[PDB]
Amino acid sequence: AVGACVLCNSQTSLRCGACIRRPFLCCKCCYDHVISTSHKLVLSVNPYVCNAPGCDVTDVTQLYLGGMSYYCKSHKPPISFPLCANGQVFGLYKNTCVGSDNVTDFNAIATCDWTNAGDYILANTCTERLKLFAAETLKATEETFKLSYGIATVREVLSDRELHLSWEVGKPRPPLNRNYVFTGYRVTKNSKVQIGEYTFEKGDYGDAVVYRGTTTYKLNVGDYFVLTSHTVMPLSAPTLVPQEHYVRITGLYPTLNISDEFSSNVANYQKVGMQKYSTLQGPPGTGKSHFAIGLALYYPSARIVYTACSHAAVDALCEKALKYLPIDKCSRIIPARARVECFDKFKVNSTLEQYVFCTVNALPETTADIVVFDEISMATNYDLSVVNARLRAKHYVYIGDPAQLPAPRTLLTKGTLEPEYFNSVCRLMKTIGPDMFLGTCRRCPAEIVDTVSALVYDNKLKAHKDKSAQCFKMFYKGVITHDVSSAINRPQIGVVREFLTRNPAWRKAVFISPYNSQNAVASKILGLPTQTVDSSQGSEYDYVIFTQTTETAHSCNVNRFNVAITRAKVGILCIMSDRDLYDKLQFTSL
Amino acid sequence: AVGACVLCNSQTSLRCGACIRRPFLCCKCCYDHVISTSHKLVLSVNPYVCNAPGCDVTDVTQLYLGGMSYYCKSHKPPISFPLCANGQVFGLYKNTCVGSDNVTDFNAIATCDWTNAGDYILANTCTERLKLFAAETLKATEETFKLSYGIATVREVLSDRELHLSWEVGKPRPPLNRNYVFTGYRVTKNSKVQIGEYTFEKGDYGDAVVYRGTTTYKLNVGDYFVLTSHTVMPLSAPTLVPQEHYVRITGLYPTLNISDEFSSNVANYQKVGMQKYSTLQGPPGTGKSHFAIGLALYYPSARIVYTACSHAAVDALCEKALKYLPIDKCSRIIPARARVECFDKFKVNSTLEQYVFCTVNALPETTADIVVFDEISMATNYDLSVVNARLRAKHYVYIGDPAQLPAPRTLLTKGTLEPEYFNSVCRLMKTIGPDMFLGTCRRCPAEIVDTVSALVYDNKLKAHKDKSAQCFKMFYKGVITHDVSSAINRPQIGVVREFLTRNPAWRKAVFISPYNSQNAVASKILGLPTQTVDSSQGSEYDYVIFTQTTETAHSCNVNRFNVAITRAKVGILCIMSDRDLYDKLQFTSL
Amino acid sequence: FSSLPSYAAFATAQEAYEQAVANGDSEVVLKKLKKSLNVAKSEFDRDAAMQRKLEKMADQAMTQMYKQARSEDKRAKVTSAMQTMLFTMLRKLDNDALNNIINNARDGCVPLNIIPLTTAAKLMVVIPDYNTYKNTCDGTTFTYASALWEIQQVVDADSKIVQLSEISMDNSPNLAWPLIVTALRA
RNA sequence: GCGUAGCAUGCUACGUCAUUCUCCUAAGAAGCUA
RNA sequence: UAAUAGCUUCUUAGGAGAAUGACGUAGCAUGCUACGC
Ligand SMILES: Nc1ncnc2c1ncn2[C@@H]1O[C@H](COP(=O)(O)OP(=O)(O)O)[C@@H](O)[C@H]1O
Ligand SMILES: Nc1ncnc2c1ncn2[C@@H]1O[C@H](COP(=O)(O)OP(=O)(O)O)[C@@H](O)[C@H]1O
Ligand SMILES: [Mg+2]
Ligand SMILES: [Mg+2]
Ligand SMILES: [Zn+2]
Ligand SMILES: [Zn+2]
Ligand SMILES: [Zn+2]
Ligand SMILES: [Zn+2]
Ligand SMILES: [Zn+2]
């Protein structure tokens, strides 16, 4: 079992045991990593523990290769020799291992807990192999953080539709939403075995969870739940395939009078054809995801795979394609579990169709003639490597904007991440500039765009509509109920309910709030379609009601608020909390 | 062949060859079984005998292996060594075998001969993997016990509906009903084979049999009858599948307009549909035979497998389901050999139908939605394990009254097996209680039902009727003749025929007796349709006559008395011998 | 080796010899203890040889037992597989036609080569070129084995479906010959 | 001269170990031929 | 999916035998010395 060193790509047979991802390391690089950090376990084809009758020594400078196995200092056969010595660590391909100077960044990548902010800015400006290793270990740490969530149990059941919850005393409680699942135990005497796959969500009154299960087993009070784990697969493909500038379009063919609507983006289509990969950066609602469909109409014969990190963004892209592209040749690829309700209007789950839409995580290994990644802000380097590995292509197009909200990054809790370190694509966009850039808002009215050209974008956007005066900024205190570990603002929802029967034209406005708890609990009291800000990105609606639940650093985030307001099409009413945020925008009186 | 040790479930390749069943035994467990008991023969992948030209040693504590064989001390090579040493018996998987100290009861299970009472009481409270083994070896012991019997033949051709009987001298003879079937052997000159099975029954006078036939092939004297001491297959499924509760009813979808007939059991129907297995004990004549039909009409589209130990109960259930349930989607599964006068009214023997009725012995390996086991008092642990092996279903429902008579249990002769240890299900019903229990008795008159609820029950029964004033209880001596393997009371039938002329009602009566000989002779001089006390318990009648022959502990068994006097509905003439049996109950004197 | 008391005898003899050598015992006692140590070590290695034979023959017996158990648990698998194959082939039989042709037999014995030819319900015709196709089974029905068959399917050598309109004189070069036609007895 | 004891030399038998060789079997990889 | 048979090369393991050497024990033969007769 041999491999290639991560930071020099020499031949090797050693791995670091203490590292979560267990990466291959050549002799020189492994010695540099172990003699300086706290990692002191090295796995060869056989692990480097001491082979006494009973002995537990793992530190590699203590050990020797004695007789025919690895033995510690006072268990060795009288004939030596030291393992970790002569500036190297003894392994296969010993005299062909060239070291590096990247054993100063690799120590930081392996050691860091991804708590600070500088770990991300060092995990995205390093070499290309470290860009993959850091993403791999970041996903591994994000997965292993779920192992610290408190074990549940059931109090009792008065109502079989709403479970009672009881967390273990002395551990944190995980948030209750759709993303997290659970699997049970019945450990009484008597079946320490799983009892099904369940999921939870809080109830408005008292303490209760209106649960859901894959089966229909009941819980005798001893039965309980534990959050399971998602093992993270290894990744190999580079984050960005290296760019080559062709003299002329290769592999793609133009069209005969593409349309009267897409006639402006022709030069950018030709530029896309010329280059190996292209980047389109634009303020929201300027024509970015309506550029990809225009590109499809410009290269009609080219098989195209559309992808995105979210589901509610690729669903909006699917709806737009249905509005424009021929619906017969489309698809939609959904995961096996399909946690969210996906788009069922095309021939779902047919990979070999000409235009194929899918999320990044559920991408199947295939080919294409151009692959369109969308909303790269939501995507981390893991998603870029995944899409670059599974989908082969002739041309790549990444469309998105950095000023929108980035990926969650649950582990990050100190400092703020600048846009230019969201991933490699955003770094390319901010460093040298996008290959295609279109700033002119075609979706939102004049008032909301004229306010968002003051929050996030430094007075760049002109736009095209007339301010319909249906942009409202509300003053309401909004008392706090930190219920589901995500806040719920009952009196703000009350303000909305008391002034949604006074607005006969606002009966279908989508309800937007940064917190998933209020966003989900609003469905009973007003009945509107509900949507969180993170998933609302990429989708437009004719009318939006936005509610700033609580003053924090999450809901008063200028990027989040800017991506929230700019989903409106003719009008938006928003109720605010921060005296500053309500003042920086210029809306109507109330 | 390798397998799992019986009392520790570790991997092993030994076997106790002296046992009737030859169970697998792990190393330490096998040593503990052989050093303690008198079983000194152990079968490995090859038998542990003395592989000398001339010698025959079976003991394992006196076997030493050498070269590639096992010899005793007089035939071993200059090399050692003991097969049975260091606390272990030399076999496969020598270091995965965990010992267990539950061999102190495995000795008593394996070495007993079931003659005493305590063997059953400790063959039922042991663990599950010994609950199965005890049942298996009990059935094997009974089958071998039925091999020492008074083989007979037919004297000569006597009638087309009746043969005669020529038994051997010096051996006992079995009981005669549909349960005991008999086999003819064609050893004529010339190649013993089988021609057909006949069941036998005592004739009118002298020596005769009025029989039931299997095959039309009519023999000469060239055949002689044995009692088909067949083989007992091993059992693997547990006696009771683990009790797991369900929140809401799964796989069972309630009906539209079930009936106004049995709508008071709707709570009990849903409690049946809730758990995995449910237990319903209903005192004699309380609707469990009707509760099965009600359950089938409460979940109309669920295939249901009805099963029972004997043909009488399952045939009564079949008749009720013909009278109430839809008829064309019914399927009674009959044995191929047809050892009984079977039931042919439905569209018989299609195992891919919805309402499938069958006997335990003739169940085919299939699947169901909810299977209703009936008369769990009759069933042994072997029947429960068989119905758990052959049938997999979402729900199991065991119905039956432990206060009725038990299984035959022929080997038991000393002491009384209390009801609690009839099987696992009766033990459940007495430990914690039946999950459902219906206490309003719809068959008996007032005085008898109140006094039966006060006989043994904790006063929970009543009648929704009035007393028919045609139940009696006499004290007539009824001189005993008993010149046959069972006791007879003919002049008691003389006294009853001295009555029965001023009482024209019961002139279609069913005769019952506590002895099969008197029952057989009662169907000879006057053609009363007969049904033994065992063949009862599952059917209701309105005309039944019951006489007592003797006075003993088999005459005062209140389980038998309760199962006897509760099959009539409006009229029964009955003969009591002991003043005890005339005074626990209130009836007219005559 | 260490379990047997031969090692204990060797160890106590060696301890006594070393103690007396360190104590400056006489030459006669030194030779006596040397002889005792020599015979103790002789017994020790002699029984260690028997221990070597014990462990060797025990490992050989264990390997033989493992091999025999494996070859007996692989025999039941092939027995069950052969039984399932035989019974599925039983269930495949066209029982009525086979019963008719076997009751027509005088001795109850018939040639095997006529068992399909008179009882098989499905016929597969493999055709290498178009002239053969036109000769043997042109049209949707044809005659073979004194019976009438109706074409239910046609596939090519690639196991792709071919329609009867595509089997023409001019479309013959575009077909992946041979063609396998599946027909049912009418 | 004999008996007992000790040392040295030689031969035979047995046990253990080291090396070399031959053969008998088993297992595996491969090559060629009909 | 991969046949029957023959020959050959190489590797590993086991047994048996042979040869040589080494140690230990026992038996027998001889020389020298101590004591007793
Ligand atoms: N050339 C055009 N002419 C008129 N309207 C346009 C044109 N391009 C885009 N639009 C409108 O602008 C909106 C931009 O949508 P989209 O591309 O999804 O924005 P984003 O990519 O920022 O989400 C579309 O809803 C479309 O109706
Ligand atoms: N809902 C009901 N109302 C009145 N009588 C009933 C009802 N259900 C059942 N019965 C009567 O109770 C008696 C029960 O006897 P049976 O059907 O043999 O079952 P079991 O022997 O288990 O009690 C039946 O004769 C039936 O007529
Ligand atoms: Mg967009
Ligand atoms: Mg009943
Ligand atoms: Zn490391
Ligand atoms: Zn390296
Ligand atoms: Zn050590
Ligand atoms: Zn035994
Ligand atoms: Zn065991």
Ligand SMILES: [Zn+2]
């Ligand atoms: Zn022997």
